[PDB]
Every structure is written in structure tokens, then in C-alpha cells.
Design an enzyme around this catalytic site. Structure first.
Site, short mmCIF file in Angstrom:
data_model
loop_
_atom_site.label_atom_id
_atom_site.label_comp_id
_atom_site.label_asym_id
_atom_site.label_seq_id
_atom_site.Cartn_x
_atom_site.Cartn_y
_atom_site.Cartn_z
N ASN A 142 -33.99 38.21 -108.52
CA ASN A 142 -34.74 37.23 -108.50
C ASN A 142 -33.89 36.22 -107.33
OD1 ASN A 142 -37.07 35.70 -109.46
ND2 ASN A 142 -35.67 34.04 -109.40
N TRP A 143 -34.85 35.68 -106.42
CA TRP A 143 -34.39 34.60 -105.64
C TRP A 143 -35.03 33.18 -105.80
CZ3 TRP A 143 -34.85 37.38 -100.09
CH2 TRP A 143 -33.89 38.23 -99.98
N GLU A 182 -38.25 38.86 -104.93
CA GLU A 182 -38.70 38.08 -103.57
C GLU A 182 -38.27 38.82 -102.49
OE1 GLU A 182 -37.63 36.62 -106.81
OE2 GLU A 182 -38.89 34.96 -106.86
N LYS A 223 -46.65 29.97 -116.15
CA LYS A 223 -45.58 29.59 -115.60
C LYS A 223 -45.86 28.60 -114.12
CE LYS A 223 -41.20 30.64 -113.36
NZ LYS A 223 -41.80 30.78 -111.80
N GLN A 234 -38.15 29.03 -115.96
CA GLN A 234 -37.74 29.55 -114.58
C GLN A 234 -37.17 30.92 -114.56
OE1 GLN A 234 -39.64 27.73 -113.11
NE2 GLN A 234 -38.37 26.35 -111.65
N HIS A 235 -37.30 31.45 -113.47
CA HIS A 235 -36.63 33.20 -113.62
C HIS A 235 -35.24 32.90 -113.77
CE1 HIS A 235 -40.73 34.62 -111.87
NE2 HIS A 235 -40.86 34.36 -113.16
N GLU A 259 -34.03 12.74 -108.58
CA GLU A 259 -35.16 13.86 -108.56
C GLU A 259 -36.37 13.80 -107.93
OE1 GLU A 259 -35.43 14.09 -112.77
OE2 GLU A 259 -33.45 15.10 -112.86
N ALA A 313 -32.61 26.16 -107.62
CA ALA A 313 -32.15 25.27 -108.78
C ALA A 313 -31.29 24.59 -108.39
CB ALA A 313 -32.08 26.12 -109.90
N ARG A 314 -30.97 23.29 -108.50
CA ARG A 314 -29.91 22.33 -108.34
C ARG A 314 -28.67 22.85 -108.84
NH1 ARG A 314 -32.01 17.42 -112.04
NH2 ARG A 314 -30.37 17.40 -113.47
C1 LIG Z 1 -37.69 23.29 -102.88
C2 LIG Z 1 -37.07 22.92 -103.98
C3 LIG Z 1 -37.53 23.55 -105.27
C4 LIG Z 1 -36.77 23.24 -106.52
C5 LIG Z 1 -35.76 22.15 -106.54
C6 LIG Z 1 -35.19 21.67 -105.38
C7 LIG Z 1 -35.89 22.01 -104.14
C8 LIG Z 1 -35.51 21.38 -102.85
C9 LIG Z 1 -34.00 20.54 -105.47
C10 LIG Z 1 -32.60 21.39 -105.67
C11 LIG Z 1 -33.59 19.62 -104.37
C12 LIG Z 1 -34.14 19.90 -106.59
C13 LIG Z 1 -34.36 20.64 -107.86
C14 LIG Z 1 -35.35 19.85 -109.22
C15 LIG Z 1 -35.93 21.10 -109.74
C16 LIG Z 1 -37.61 20.74 -109.76
C17 LIG Z 1 -35.32 22.34 -109.06
C18 LIG Z 1 -34.22 22.61 -109.90
O1 LIG Z 1 -33.28 22.33 -109.98
N1 LIG Z 1 -34.86 23.48 -110.95
C19 LIG Z 1 -35.95 24.21 -111.01
O2 LIG Z 1 -35.79 24.86 -112.20
N2 LIG Z 1 -36.71 24.34 -110.05
C20 LIG Z 1 -36.24 23.40 -109.20
N3 LIG Z 1 -37.22 23.72 -107.65
C21 LIG Z 1 -38.32 24.37 -107.65
C22 LIG Z 1 -38.13 26.26 -108.20
O3 LIG Z 1 -37.58 26.59 -106.79
C23 LIG Z 1 -39.67 26.71 -107.94
O4 LIG Z 1 -40.10 26.35 -109.15
C24 LIG Z 1 -39.40 28.37 -108.02
O5 LIG Z 1 -40.70 28.49 -108.30
C25 LIG Z 1 -38.53 28.94 -108.78
O6 LIG Z 1 -38.41 30.46 -108.86
P1 LIG Z 1 -38.61 31.50 -109.52
O7 LIG Z 1 -40.13 31.28 -109.75
O8 LIG Z 1 -38.07 32.60 -109.08
O9 LIG Z 1 -38.18 30.87 -110.99
N4 LIG Z 1 -34.95 21.84 -107.76
K LIG Z 2 -39.05 32.32 -106.42
MN LIG Z 3 -39.03 34.70 -109.27
#
Ligand SMILES: Cc1cc2c3c(c1C)C(C)(C)C[C@H]1C[C@@H](C)[C@]4(C(=O)NC(=O)N=C4N2C[C@H](O)[C@H](O)[C@H](O)COP(=O)(O)O)N31
Ligand SMILES: [K+]
Ligand SMILES: [Mn+2]
Ligand SMILES: Cc1cc2c3c(c1C)C(C)(C)C[C@H]1C[C@@H](C)[C@]4(C(=O)NC(=O)N=C4N2C[C@H](O)[C@H](O)[C@H](O)COP(=O)(O)O)N31
Ligand SMILES: [K+]
Ligand SMILES: [K+]
Ligand SMILES: [K+]
Ligand SMILES: [Mn+2]
Lengths: 500, 500
Positions: A165-166, A230, A388, A187-188, A279, A169-170
Site C-alpha cells: 500500500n501507498w 497502488e 471506505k 485507512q489501508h 486540518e 497520512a500526516r
Molecule cells: C492529499 C492528502 C491526503 C490526506 C492527508 C493529507 C493530504 C495532503 C495531509 C497529510 C496534508 C493531511 C492529513 C489529514 C488526513 C485527512 C490525512 C491523514 O493524515 N490521514 C488519513 O488517514 N488520510 C489523510 N489523507 C487522505 C488519504 O491519503 C486518502 O484517504 C487515501 O485514500 C488513503 O490511502 P488508502 O486508501 O491506501 O488508505 N492527510
Molecule cells: K491510496
Molecule cells: Mn490503498
């Protein structure tokens, strides 16, 4: 190397586009870089590249702010996102989302291992770095830490090796060799972490790569399905196998041109203070610290003159809106279609702080289903809110064929005029809620459950016999020949360019 | 004569402001005038003055479109409304609404009768006019009639003579000497009509004056209290007694400088087909005709070179938004304050199609009340939704002190991020509903009842100990000295006027 496949080339592309401001005088990573970036995001200005960051040592690091934010002109509004994907800079949102969905019915193209790459140009072992000595930004004045990780990609693999997984997450610096960050369900990164914890044998081998290929950071931000790697999805989307190099201290693979790579472990037992953080919904709750996941860093590798991308997130408009919102919307559109729902288009209106998704309905199909608002609302909400892909979204707005969901003004018009409060809505209280929305985590109800709604802005005849109105607007309330006459005589009469 | 006291002077003021386009070539009142006007309203262009209207005869009539619509610049956005009230063109919405409320705790200044005025320059008796022969506009292609009355003032008096009401309600030409129009509860024209019907003795003596003093048309659009004569309220607001002349055929009085006056009766027994009409929420339902009130016209009097104001209403932004919405909001603000609710400001967001009002709460006062969201929501909705001033408004959004309710972007941000759907809302089903909203009159529920909601976008601590967040924005997330540094260096670094 193409801009969509190489961050360093992406930065050059933004320069060539006249979408980049290079700041070569000293800028403080304590607030100043992020304040500039915030101002850029609030005004849709050019991306800032801080080439002279106070505290940068031995190549670590320059910062690029606002990598996925909006341009001022309407014609190339989404050009920075198009540049992540080899699309023309004038690409529409529909074209960007279609590109991100295109690999969903293609065979994956697995990555290619190469023996080395630019991310191996420099290294620092366990005795040579200190994360508190790097110019990690303080992004908002009340943040609980210096958020190194706002636009890098976490890399974790299932214990059985079958899913890598890629994701974004902060994470923030905890001490010289650890980070803390958010690792939350569904989340993954959390799902994989749970697999390792149930095995109980070791910490999770981990890497965090910053300045990865732009197409990869886009997929990292998208909720593609459980168990889908990914890297292979990005390969299929781009039509090219991504080149990866092995980490030095574990057997994970990172993009060859990554600007900066951290290698280590995500603990299955340890936690540390994490947050608060400014946030995506526009708030920070100062002093709201909670225990988060804890990562240990064993090795850093990096490019010569490495560049760290940064999201200075908050109020409109930044990567948390343009990427989180829109990419969730894209997956929800697909999910609906796969469940035989007559949805043509989905978008998360910026005006909703990306907490709504507007779903455009093919009302000819809807009429053939011979159903009702109550029935249809329930079916759409059960599909999306139990998945999800619906995690971040608290209100779904169903709209007919006349509404362009990519235009917030039209979504608000439809919502406000076609959805009767209460009667035309179904509330969902027994679904997972997104705790980061202030009304959830800092609200009157359970932080993690409920607070969701489907609002039906379809009119009654859209379920039966067809649309029974015309808009009271210039387009719809006047015949074609008259409209054209009016347009042709507009400047002659005395009244007031596309690109701008 | 001052612009706020004389329509003809108001037109000159718009010219002098460079806010007027005079069109001296022939324009068709069948759709063309209204299509031009619609395009102006959708683009915030200059008001059109049609001086050469096809079908104009013996002075009847020129048309001024978009008299109360928006200007393009932010600095004088509401300048056309300011020109109705002797305010500077840069006046804020708060200053315009305060001006409209100012007479609410002043003694009325009754009108002055004068023996004649410009509205008496020409007359046409019962044998000399035919309303179907005048250049009355067709405003939208599917309208059910030619809507002569979109910006004039109906004048009716209670049987006992103690209350003379001035109001705007639409009307269209029925035949050579009659109009039909809307006369619906709880409007004052309806309330007065009911008094005459219960007396049962005669039709209601009536006049309709077009091109009245601008300050008078503003009060005509405002829900000032039952039993209050608008003329005396306008006198107090302007600090001057309005000059009125008696009608020739009845004992009603009309503004001396009215452009065009119709004298006659509103029937207590007869009805005729009325509508459909392209309405304030942006729709027309073609073929949706219903029986409306019927007015008989006995006499027309008019100024030399008379000008008929016209509202080409529909989608944003026109007089139905700028005046209906904002003036209801102003009265609701006052109503709340009179009921001891801690409301400082109210506005109807344009983005809501003026179906919402955002209520700004003095949260210091709120905290002293030691109450809860549920309690407070209920109290606010019972006050507003059971009163005539709340008639047109279906959603109330309560917001704390940090939100500028006159900025739709901030209202939407607060709504979307601080109000949990369902839990933080109270629905009202046993209140009068506004049937013209499509989800009411063409919706799934009772056209005239319910469909209202109070949405509480106050956060929990706003009721107890105070705001516990800072915004993740440039203003709030960075210290003052840094912000100023960033602003001062903005153009030097390479990034991008008030009037515009
Ligand atoms: C574009 C972006 C996407 C974010 C986040 C950010 C940016 C810029 C930052 C780092 C600035 C702010 C935080 C806040 C927070 C919302 C979170 C996070 O900390 N935790 C989280 O669980 N999801 C986040 N995402 C969304 C996440 O990437 C997507 O949900 C993605 O589907 C996860 O990949 P998998 O499906 O493979 O699980 N962050
Ligand atoms: K992803
Ligand atoms: Mn994923
Ligand atoms: C500024 C404006 C105000 C309007 C209308 C219009 C414009 C331009 C037009 C004519 C274009 C469209 C129609 C549509 C419709 C909304 C209506 C109407 O036909 N019926 C109605 O009952 N109220 C209307 N109002 C609002 C009304 O003036 C206020 O409610 C006022 O408080 C009434 O005075 P009283 O308090 O003294 O009762 N119209
Ligand atoms: K509906
Ligand atoms: K009135
Ligand atoms: K709330
Ligand atoms: Mn009245």
C-alpha cells in the site's frame, strides 16, 4: 524523465508553465514557509519553491509548497493536478477523475526493480541524522509538532507480501529518530498495521518517500480498493511500469527518483503524542493532543539538492480539497455504478469543505427503475456510507441531469431549491463517521459514528415522467435566436477573455 | 428632487454613476428587453434603460431593467440599493439594512398631501386605454401572461382607514382593463383583502404606482409590522414627509412623482388565470396556471416620457434576492432581538437562493443564558418561523461571532463544518411554508406547511466556556508580525485594486 513520473521534472514543468516562484533568499521553516504557502492557497497564486531554507544542511532540504493547489485562471484552474498525470493543463475535472479511474478495469502493470536511482545519491545512517536538526516546518502556529509529512507516501506491505500500500497520512517529528502520526480506521495503513499486530511477531517494515512520481502521489491520495497495490494501478494508468529501488535496510521498494526516503518501522506496540494539526476542514484545536502511531527511522537517503513537498492545509483551497475530496468523489462514482446505481458524475463541492459529494443521476435510467425518493436515498446511502470510499463524506446530494456537479454554484442552487429539509433526506446514524470534521470529533455526538445524510435534490417528476420545469435563466428562458442576437449586440449596446 | 425620493432622479443618478446603459434603438418588449435584463443580472452589468420600446404609444412607456441588482465591483457592489436610500455607493449591506430598520423605533412621519404632481401630466380614462395595447413585457418565454407588475407598489387601505399598505406583489395583464396577480397569505395585501371580503360590501379600492420614490419601493419589499403604514415608516427613515397626490377616481394617495399610476379595484369575488411566472428561486413550471386575484383598472395617469421599472427575475442575482432576501433578514434580526435572543446580524445568503438566513450570535450573551443547542434552536425557530417575517425562509443557520454572515463563503464553511446533520438541527413541520420554493409547491409534501429547519452551526463550547479553536487560515494561524512581513514582501518575492 517525464513530469508525471519524476518529481524533479514536475518542478521544472511548473517553472516552464510560469506556475512557480523560486524564492532564493532565506526563508524560515518555522511558520514563514507555510504562511507564504497558505497565502498562495487562499489566493490561487503560483507554487512557491523555497531554495534557501534556514536550517538546510548537507542537502536536506528545499521545500515546494502548494504542489496540488489551484491556478488563478479558469481555463487552467486544475493545471497543477493535470501536470501530475501527463494531461493537458486545460484538463477538466471530469478528465482528471476519469484518468484516475482508468486503471480500475485494466490489468495492473507491476513495477520494475532497478539497481539504483537518484534517491541513492546521499545517505545518512542511524548515527548521522537527527530529525530535530532538519528544517522541518512548523505549518500552523498551534501545531503540536513539526509536520515533516504532509505530501509524502507511506509504504507498508501485508505480512504475506501480497499487498503493498501507498498512501498519504500526516506525521510529525517526535524526536531525533522517531515520528508520530495518524493511523486510523478504515485507512489501508491501519488495515495493514492491524495485520502485523495480530501476527504479533514484529514491528511493520516501513518507508516514507517524499517527492515521489506525481502520478504515484495522486494514487496515494485515492481510496482505490482494499488489497490493490497502488504501484500496479499507477503503472496501468500511466501505461508504464514504475521503476523502484530497494531500501537499504529493509526489503521494501521505493520510487527510484524519490527526493527523500526514510526507512524504518511502524511500531505495533508504541505510541506517542500526536497533533494537534491545522486540518482540511479549516481548524486547529490548540492543545488537543492524542496518542498516535510511532515510527522509528533507521536511515535517510536523498537526492542531491533534495526537495520536500509540503501542504500548508486548512481553509480553501489546498491539496486536502483538490485531492482528498475529488479522488474520493471519483471512487464513489465508480462504486455507485458497480452497484447498478444510475450515477454519471460525482464531485465534492469546495464550498462544502469537501464534506459533501454531489451525485449526478441519469434520470432516464432512474425513471425505468420505478422507484421513490425514500427507496433510492436509502439504497445510495447504504452503498456509499458503508464503504471506505464514503468515509470522509457526510452529505450526499442527488441531482438530476441538468446540474453540473463540478460547478459548486449549481450544486448549491439545486440543494437549496429542490431538497425539502427533513422529508427529502435520510439520516444515517449507524455508519462510520469522520472524526476530523469539527461537528464530529469536537461535536455533540459520537465522534466516530453517524452524522451522515443523503439529501435528495431530485424533483418528483424526475422519478416518473421527466423534468417539468425550465430554469428562469438566460440560457433556458429565451429562444436560441434571441439569445444569439443579444450576445452579438452586447458590446454595441454598451455592456461589458477565456484564457485570462 | 433627490434620487431616493424621485424615480426620475434615481435614473439620472445611475447615469451619473456610469451604472446605466441607454438603449435608444428599438427593443422588443416581447422577451428581448427581459433577456437583456436577465443577462445584466447574471453578470452584474450596468442597468439597461430602454428608451425605444416597440409598441410604446403616447408616452407609455420606456423600461428600466435591473433597478436593484448588483454592480460588478466589490467596492460598490450594493451601490444601486444605496442609491435607493441616499447612502454612499460604497455602503455595506449592514449599513443598508440598518438604514431600512432605523424607522422601527422612530415616530412615523406621515405623508403630506399636495394638489398635483408629475404623475398627473397625462391621463387615460376607461375609454382611452387598453392594457393589451401597451408594450407590457413578456419576461420569460413560458410565462402565462405579460407581467406589467414586477417593480411597482400596490396601495390598499383597511376598511376603517387606519392602515395603508404599500407592497410589491406580481401581476399580469388579463384583458384590456384587468390584471391578475398573487394575493396570498400572510402578505399584507392579502390581510387587507380579507378585511374587505369579511365586510362583504365592496371591492377593495386600489392603486398600483410604478416608478415610485426609491425609498418607498424598498419599504414596499420589506415585511415591516402588521398595521404599520409604509408611507410613515419611509418618512421617518428618510427624515422627510413624502408628498402624495390623491387618485382621480378614488380616495387613495399616490407618490406625486410616480411614473405611472393605475387606479381601480381589487375584487373580493372574482378571480382569473394567473401564472406561471419565472420566479425568485430560478424556475418556471410551464402550464402551471392557477386562479389569482383580479384587479380592474379604471384610469391611468402618467408622467411625460414615463419609465416602467422591471425585474427580470430568476437565477442569481436580481431584486428578488437583493431586496426580498436581505430585507426579510433585516426584519428577522430585529424580531430576534425584540424576543431577547442574542442575535447581532442576519443575512440571506445568495448561494441559498435566499431560502436560508444566517444569524450571527453574540456568544458572550449566549454563554450567560446557560442553555443548550436543542433548547436554543427551538426557541429561535419558534420566534422566527411563527412570524410573517420568517415566511420566505426555510433554513436558519446559527453561527458564532467569528462568522461574517454577509459573506456567503464563510456561512457555507461554518454550516458545512460545525452543524452535524440531524443531531444539530430541529425540523419544523407545523409552521407556514413558502409554496413558491420548488420543493414546497412542486415537492413531495404539503405545499403550504412545514419543510423548515434550524441548523445550529455553533460549536459546543460556544454555549459554555468560549471558542476553543483557531482557524487554519492565513489570518489566524500565523502571528501578526509574520503576516505583515509576508504581505510586505509579496510582490518582491514574485507573487500577484480595491475599487476595480
Ligand atoms: C492529499 C492528502 C491526503 C490526506 C492527508 C493529507 C493530504 C495532503 C495531509 C497529510 C496534508 C493531511 C492529513 C489529514 C488526513 C485527512 C490525512 C491523514 O493524515 N490521514 C488519513 O488517514 N488520510 C489523510 N489523507 C487522505 C488519504 O491519503 C486518502 O484517504 C487515501 O485514500 C488513503 O490511502 P488508502 O486508501 O491506501 O488508505 N492527510
Ligand atoms: K491510496
Ligand atoms: Mn490503498
Ligand atoms: C422585490 C420584490 C418583492 C416581491 C416580489 C417581486 C419583487 C421584485 C416580484 C414581483 C418580481 C416577484 C414576486 C414573487 C413574490 C415573492 C412577490 C409576489 O408576487 N408576491 C408576494 O407576496 N411577495 C413578493 N415579493 C416580496 C414582498 O414584496 C415582501 O414579502 C413584502 O414584505 C410584502 O409587503 P408587506 O409586508 O406589506 O405584505 N414578488
Ligand atoms: K427532492
Ligand atoms: K411592505
Ligand atoms: K453544532
Ligand atoms: Mn406592510
Amino acid at each position: 524523465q517525464p513530469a508525471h513520473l519524476c518529481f524533479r521534472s514536475f518542478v521544472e514543468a511548473l517553472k516552464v508553465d510560469n506556475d512557480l516562484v523560486e524564492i532564493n533568499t532565506p526563508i524560515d521553516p518555522n511558520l514563514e514557509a507555510a504562511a507564504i504557502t497558505r497565502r498562495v492557497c487562499e489566493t490561487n497564486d503560483k507554487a512557491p519553491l523555497f531554495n534557501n531554507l534556514i536550517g538546510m544542511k548537507n542537502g536536506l532540504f528545499r521545500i515546494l509548497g502548494a504542489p496540488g493547489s489551484l491556478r488563478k485562471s479558469s481555463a487552467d484552474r486544475y493545471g497543477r493536478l493535470a501536470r501530475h498525470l501527463a494531461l493537458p493543463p486545460t484538463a477538466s475535472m471530469r478528465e482528471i477523475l476519469d484518468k484516475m479511474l482508468s486503471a480500475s478495469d485494466m490489468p495492473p502493470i507491476p513495477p520494475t526493480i532497478v539497481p539504483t536511482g537518484p534517491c541513492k545519491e546521499n545517505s545518512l545512517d542511524d548515527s548521522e541524522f537527527d530529525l530535530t536538526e532538519l528544517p522541518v516546518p512548523l505549518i500552523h502556529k498551534s501545531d503540536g509538532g513539526k509536520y515533516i509529512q504532509t505530501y509524502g507516501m507511506h509504504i507498508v506491505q501485508s505480512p504475506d507480501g501480497t499487498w503493498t500500500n501507498w498512501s498519504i497520512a500526516r506525521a510529525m517529528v517526535h524526536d531525533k529518530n522517531h515520528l508520530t502520526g495518524l493511523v486510523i480506521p478504515p485507512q489501508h495503513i491501519w488495515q495493514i498495521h492491524q495485520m502485523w499486530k495480530k501476527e504479533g511477531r514484529s514491528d511493520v517494515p516501513w518507508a516514507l518517500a517524499f517527492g515521489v512520481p506525481p502520478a504515484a502521489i495522486m494514487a496515494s491520495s485515492m481510496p482505490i480498493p482494499d488489497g490493490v497495490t497502488e504501484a500496479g494501478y499507477v503503472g496501468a494508468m500511466t501505461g508504464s511500469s514504475l521503476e523502484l529501488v530497494k531500501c537499504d535496510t529493509n526489503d521494501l521498494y521505493v520510487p527510484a527518483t524519490s527526493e527523500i526516503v526514510l526507512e524504518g518501522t511502524l511500531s505495533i506496540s508504541e505510541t506517542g503524542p500526536e497533533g494537534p494539526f491545522g486540518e482540511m476542514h479549516g481548524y486547529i484545536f490548540p492543545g488537543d493532543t492524542h496518542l498516535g502511531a510511532k515510527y522509528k527511522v533507521n536511515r535517510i537517503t536523498y537526492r542531491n539538492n533534495a526537495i520536500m513537498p509540503m501542504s500548508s492545509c486548512g481553509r480553501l483551497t489546498d491539496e486536502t480539497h483538490t485531492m482528498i475530496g475529488s479522488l474520493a468523489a471519483a471512487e464513489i462514482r465508480k462504486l455507485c455504478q458497480q452497484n447498478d446505481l444510475p450515477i454519471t458524475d460525482a464531485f465534492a463541492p469546495f464550498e462544502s469543505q469537501v464534506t459533501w459529494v454531489a451525485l449526478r443521476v441519469d434520470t432516464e435510467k432512474l425513471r425505468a427503475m420505478k422507484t421513490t425518493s425514500e427507496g433510492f436515498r436509502k439504497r445510495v446511502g447504504d452503498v456509499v456510507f458503508n464503504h471506505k470510499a464514503g468515509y470522509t463524506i457526510h452529505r450526499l446530494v442527488l441531482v438530476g441531469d441538468d446540474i453540473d456537479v463540478y460547478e459548486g454554484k449549481d450544486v448549491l442552487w439545486a440543494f437549496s431549491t429542490r431538497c425539502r429539509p427533513g422529508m427529502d433526506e435520510t439520516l444515517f446514524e449507524d455508519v462510520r463517521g469522520f472524526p476530523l470534521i469539527p461537528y464530529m470529533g469536537h461535536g455533540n455526538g459520537p465522534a466516530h459514528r453517524g452524522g451522515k445524510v443523503v439529501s435528495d435534490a431530485l424533483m418528483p417528476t424526475e422519478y416518473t415522467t421527466g423534468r417539468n420545469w425550465e430554469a428562469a435563466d438566460f440560457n433556458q428562458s429565451y429562444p436560441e435566436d434571441l439569445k444569439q442576437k443579444v450576445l452579438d449586440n452586447w458590446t454595441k449596446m454598451g455592456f461589458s477573455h477565456h484564457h485570462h
